[PDB]
């Protein structure tokens, strides 16, 4: 979750 959102952003 954390990576997914950090890379989306
Ligand atoms: Co974080």
**Interatomic CA distance for residues 9 and 7, integer angstroms:** 5
Collapse the DSSP code of 1 into the 3-class scheme (helix H, G, I; strand E, B; otherwise coil) and give the result.
coil
What is the Å distance from ligand 1's center to 9 Cα? 11
Count CA atoms closer than 13 A to 3's CA, side-chain side: 0
Distance 2 CA to ligand 1 centre (A): 6
Resolution expressed in Å: 0.8
Residue at token pair 């954390």: 2
As a whole number of angstroms, the distance between CA 9 and CA 2 comes to 11
Measured in angstroms, how far is the CA atom of residue 7 from the centroid of ligand 1?
10
Token pair for 1: 């979750």
How far, in Å, from the CA of 4 to the mean position of ligand 1? 10
């Amino acid at each position: 979750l954390a990576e997914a959102l950090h890379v989306a952003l």
